[PDB]
PDB file of C-alpha atoms and ligand atoms in Angstrom:
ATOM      1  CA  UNK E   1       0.000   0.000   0.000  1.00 15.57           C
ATOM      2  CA  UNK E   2       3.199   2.211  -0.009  1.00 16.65           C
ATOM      3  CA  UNK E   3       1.734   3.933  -3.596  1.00 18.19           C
ATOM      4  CA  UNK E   4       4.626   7.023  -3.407  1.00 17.66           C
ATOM      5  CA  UNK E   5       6.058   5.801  -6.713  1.00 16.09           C
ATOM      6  CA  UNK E   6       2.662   5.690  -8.556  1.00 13.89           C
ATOM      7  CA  UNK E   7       1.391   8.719  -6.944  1.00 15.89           C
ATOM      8  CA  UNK E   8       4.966  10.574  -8.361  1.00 13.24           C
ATOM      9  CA  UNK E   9       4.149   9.315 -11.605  1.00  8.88           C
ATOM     10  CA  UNK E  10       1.297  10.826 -12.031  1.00  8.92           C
ATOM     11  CA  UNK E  11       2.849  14.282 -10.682  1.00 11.02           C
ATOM     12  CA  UNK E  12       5.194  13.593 -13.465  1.00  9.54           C
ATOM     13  CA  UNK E  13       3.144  12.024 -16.118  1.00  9.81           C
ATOM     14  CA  UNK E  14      -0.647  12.630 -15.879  1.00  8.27           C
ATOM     15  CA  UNK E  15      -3.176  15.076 -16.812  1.00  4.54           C
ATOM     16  CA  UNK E  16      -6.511  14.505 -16.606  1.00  4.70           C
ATOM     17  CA  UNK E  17      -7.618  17.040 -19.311  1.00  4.50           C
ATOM     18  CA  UNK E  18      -5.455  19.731 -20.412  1.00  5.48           C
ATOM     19  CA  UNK E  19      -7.234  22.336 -22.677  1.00  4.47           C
ATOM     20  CA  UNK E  20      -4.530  23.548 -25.011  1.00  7.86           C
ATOM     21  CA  UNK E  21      -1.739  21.492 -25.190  1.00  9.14           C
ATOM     22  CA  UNK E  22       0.898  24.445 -26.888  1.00  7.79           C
ATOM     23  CA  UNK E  23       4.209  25.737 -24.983  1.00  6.64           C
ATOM     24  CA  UNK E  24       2.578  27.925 -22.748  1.00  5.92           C
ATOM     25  CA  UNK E  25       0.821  24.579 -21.989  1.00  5.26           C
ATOM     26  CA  UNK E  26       4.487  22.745 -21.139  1.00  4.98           C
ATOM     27  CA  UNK E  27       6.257  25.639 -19.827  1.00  7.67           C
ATOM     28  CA  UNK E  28       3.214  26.347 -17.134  1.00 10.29           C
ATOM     29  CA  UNK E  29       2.614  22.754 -16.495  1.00 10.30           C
ATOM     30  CA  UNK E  30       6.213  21.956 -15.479  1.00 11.95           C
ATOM     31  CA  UNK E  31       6.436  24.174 -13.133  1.00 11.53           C
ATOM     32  CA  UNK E  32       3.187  22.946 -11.287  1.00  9.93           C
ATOM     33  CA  UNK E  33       4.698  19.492 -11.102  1.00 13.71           C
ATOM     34  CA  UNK E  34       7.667  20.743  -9.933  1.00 17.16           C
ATOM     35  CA  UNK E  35       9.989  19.755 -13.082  1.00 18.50           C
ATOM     36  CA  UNK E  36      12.105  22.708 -13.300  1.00 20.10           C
ATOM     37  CA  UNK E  37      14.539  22.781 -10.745  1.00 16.88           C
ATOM     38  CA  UNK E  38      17.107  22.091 -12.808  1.00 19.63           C
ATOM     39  CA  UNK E  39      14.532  21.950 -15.790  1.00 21.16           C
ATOM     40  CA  UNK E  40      13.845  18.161 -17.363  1.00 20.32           C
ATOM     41  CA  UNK E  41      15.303  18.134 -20.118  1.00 21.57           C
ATOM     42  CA  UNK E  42      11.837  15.698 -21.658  1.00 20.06           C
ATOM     43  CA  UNK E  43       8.851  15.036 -19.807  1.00 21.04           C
ATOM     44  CA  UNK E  44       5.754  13.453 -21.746  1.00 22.28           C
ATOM     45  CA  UNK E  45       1.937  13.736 -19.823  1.00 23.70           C
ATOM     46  CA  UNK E  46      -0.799  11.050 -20.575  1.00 22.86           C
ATOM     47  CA  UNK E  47      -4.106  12.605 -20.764  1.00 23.61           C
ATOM     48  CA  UNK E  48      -7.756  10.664 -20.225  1.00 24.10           C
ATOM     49  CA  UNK E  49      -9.126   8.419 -17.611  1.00 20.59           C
ATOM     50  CA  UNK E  50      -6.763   6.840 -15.045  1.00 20.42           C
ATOM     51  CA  UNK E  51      -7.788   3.672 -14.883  1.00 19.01           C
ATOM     52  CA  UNK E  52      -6.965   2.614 -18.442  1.00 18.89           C
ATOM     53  CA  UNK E  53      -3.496   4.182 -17.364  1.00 20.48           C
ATOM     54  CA  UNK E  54      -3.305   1.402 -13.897  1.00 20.49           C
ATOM     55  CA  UNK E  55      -4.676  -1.372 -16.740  1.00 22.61           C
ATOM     56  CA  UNK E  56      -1.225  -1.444 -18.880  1.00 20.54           C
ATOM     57  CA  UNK E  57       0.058  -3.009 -15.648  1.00 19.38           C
ATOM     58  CA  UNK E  58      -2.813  -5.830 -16.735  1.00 19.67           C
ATOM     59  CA  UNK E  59      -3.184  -8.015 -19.961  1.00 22.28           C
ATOM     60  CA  UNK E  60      -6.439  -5.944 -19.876  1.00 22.63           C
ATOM     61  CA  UNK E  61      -4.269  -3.193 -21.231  1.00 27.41           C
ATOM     62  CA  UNK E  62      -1.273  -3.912 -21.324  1.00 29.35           C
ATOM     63  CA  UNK E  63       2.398  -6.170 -23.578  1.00 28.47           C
ATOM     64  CA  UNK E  64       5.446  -7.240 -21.689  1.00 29.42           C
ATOM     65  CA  UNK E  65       8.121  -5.098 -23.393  1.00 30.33           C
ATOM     66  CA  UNK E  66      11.647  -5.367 -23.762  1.00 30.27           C
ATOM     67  CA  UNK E  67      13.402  -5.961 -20.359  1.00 29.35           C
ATOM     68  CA  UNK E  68      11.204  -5.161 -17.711  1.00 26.04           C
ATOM     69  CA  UNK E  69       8.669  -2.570 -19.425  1.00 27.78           C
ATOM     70  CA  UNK E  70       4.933  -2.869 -20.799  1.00 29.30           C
ATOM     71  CA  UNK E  71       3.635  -1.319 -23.449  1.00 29.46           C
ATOM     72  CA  UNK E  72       0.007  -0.411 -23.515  1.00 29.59           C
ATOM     73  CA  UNK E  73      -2.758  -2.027 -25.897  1.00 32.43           C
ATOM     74  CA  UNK E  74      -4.829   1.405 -26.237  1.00 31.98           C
ATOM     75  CA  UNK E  75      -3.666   4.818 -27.453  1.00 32.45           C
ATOM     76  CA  UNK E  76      -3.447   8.086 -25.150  1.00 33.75           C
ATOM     77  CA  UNK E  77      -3.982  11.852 -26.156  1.00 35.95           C
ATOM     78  CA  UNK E  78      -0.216  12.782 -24.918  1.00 35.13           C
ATOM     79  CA  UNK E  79       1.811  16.071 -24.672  1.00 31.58           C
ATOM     80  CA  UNK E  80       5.508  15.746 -24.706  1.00 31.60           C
ATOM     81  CA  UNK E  81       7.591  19.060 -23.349  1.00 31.76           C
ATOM     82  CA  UNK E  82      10.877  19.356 -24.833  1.00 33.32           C
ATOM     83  CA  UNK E  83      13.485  21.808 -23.123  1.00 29.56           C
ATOM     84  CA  UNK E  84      14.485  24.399 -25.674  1.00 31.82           C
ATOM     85  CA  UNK E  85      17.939  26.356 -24.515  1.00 30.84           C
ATOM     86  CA  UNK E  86      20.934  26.208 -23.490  1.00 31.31           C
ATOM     87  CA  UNK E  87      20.642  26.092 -19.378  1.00 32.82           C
ATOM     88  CA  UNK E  88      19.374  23.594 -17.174  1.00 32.28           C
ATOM     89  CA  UNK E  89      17.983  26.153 -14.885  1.00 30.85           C
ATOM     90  CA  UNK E  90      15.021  28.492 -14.789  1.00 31.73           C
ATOM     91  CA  UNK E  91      13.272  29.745 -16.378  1.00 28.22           C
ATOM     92  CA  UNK E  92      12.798  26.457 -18.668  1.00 28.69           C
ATOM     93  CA  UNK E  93      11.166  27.511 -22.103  1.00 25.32           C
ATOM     94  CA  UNK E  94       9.312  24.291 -23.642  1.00 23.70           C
ATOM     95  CA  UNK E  95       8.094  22.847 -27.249  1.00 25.20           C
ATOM     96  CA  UNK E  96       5.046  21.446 -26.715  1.00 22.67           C
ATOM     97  CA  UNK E  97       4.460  18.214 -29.516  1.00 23.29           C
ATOM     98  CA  UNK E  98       0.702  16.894 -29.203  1.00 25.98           C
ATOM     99  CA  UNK E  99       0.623  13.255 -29.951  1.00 24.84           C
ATOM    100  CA  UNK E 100      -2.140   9.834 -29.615  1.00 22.87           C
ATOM    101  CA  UNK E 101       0.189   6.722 -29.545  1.00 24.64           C
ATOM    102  CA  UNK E 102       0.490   3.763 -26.953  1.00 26.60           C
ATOM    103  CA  UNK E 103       2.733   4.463 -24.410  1.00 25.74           C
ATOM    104  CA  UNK E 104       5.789   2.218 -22.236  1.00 27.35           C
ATOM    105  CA  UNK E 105       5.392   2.397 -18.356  1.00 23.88           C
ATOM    106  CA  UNK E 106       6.937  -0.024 -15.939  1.00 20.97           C
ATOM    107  CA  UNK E 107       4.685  -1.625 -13.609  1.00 21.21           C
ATOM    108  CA  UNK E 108       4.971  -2.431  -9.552  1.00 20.59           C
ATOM    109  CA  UNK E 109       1.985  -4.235  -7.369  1.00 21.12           C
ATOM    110  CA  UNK E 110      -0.245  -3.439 -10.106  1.00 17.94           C
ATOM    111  CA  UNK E 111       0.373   0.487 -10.757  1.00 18.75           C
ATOM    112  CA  UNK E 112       2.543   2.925 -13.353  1.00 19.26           C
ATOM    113  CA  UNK E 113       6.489   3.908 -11.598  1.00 19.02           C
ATOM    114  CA  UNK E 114       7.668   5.334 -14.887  1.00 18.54           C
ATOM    115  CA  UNK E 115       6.927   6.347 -17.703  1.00 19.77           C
ATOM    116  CA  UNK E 116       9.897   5.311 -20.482  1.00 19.51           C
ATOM    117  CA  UNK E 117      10.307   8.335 -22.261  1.00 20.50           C
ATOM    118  CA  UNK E 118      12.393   6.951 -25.362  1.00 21.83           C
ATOM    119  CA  UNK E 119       9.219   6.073 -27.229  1.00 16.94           C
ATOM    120  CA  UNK E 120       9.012  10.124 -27.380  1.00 16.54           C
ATOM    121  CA  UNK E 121      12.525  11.419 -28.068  1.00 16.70           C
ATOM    122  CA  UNK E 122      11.812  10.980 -31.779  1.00 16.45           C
TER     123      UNK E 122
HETATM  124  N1  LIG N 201      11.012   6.615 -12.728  1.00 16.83           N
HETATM  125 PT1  LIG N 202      11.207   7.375 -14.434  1.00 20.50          PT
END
């Protein structure tokens, strides 16, 4: 019942609806979750429901990937921020790219740790 690891992952990597998912989007959003101190360089959010999020950790919803990953059986409405500049500290301008793809998490006592974000790098 210690959930700190899936309750930091979605600090890091959920939002439940977003609006408008441009670079004021990223650049505000980053700092809310605290993801600017030094700035991330990537950090990719997973919009929609949560539970379909928690089912990739099932076959419900979820592959076994690569080493120790899964890879989800649905598609998610995702934003990835990527850090434009030149410092690692504040203030941390972002590109926002808008995507809808299936997404790589690992998976602990049924719930989302991480989010891999390699599938995004592009
Ligand atoms: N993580
Ligand atoms: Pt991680």
């Amino acid at each position: 019942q210690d959930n700190s690891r899936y309750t930091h992952f979605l600090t890091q990597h959920y939002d439940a609806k977003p609006q408008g998912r441009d670079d004021r989007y990223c650049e505000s959003i980053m700092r809310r979750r605290g993801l600017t101190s030094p700035c991330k360089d990537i950090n990719t959010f997973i919009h929609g429901n949560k539970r379909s999020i928690k089912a990739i950790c099932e076959n419900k919803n979820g592959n076994p990937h690569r080493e120790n990953l899964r890879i989800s059986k649905s598609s998610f409405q995702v934003t990835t921020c990527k850090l434009h500049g030149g410092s690692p500290w504040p203030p941390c301008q972002y590109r926002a790219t808008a995507g809808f793809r299936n997404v790589v998490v690992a998976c602990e006592n049924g719930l989302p740790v991480h989010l891999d974000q390699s599938i995004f790098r592009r």
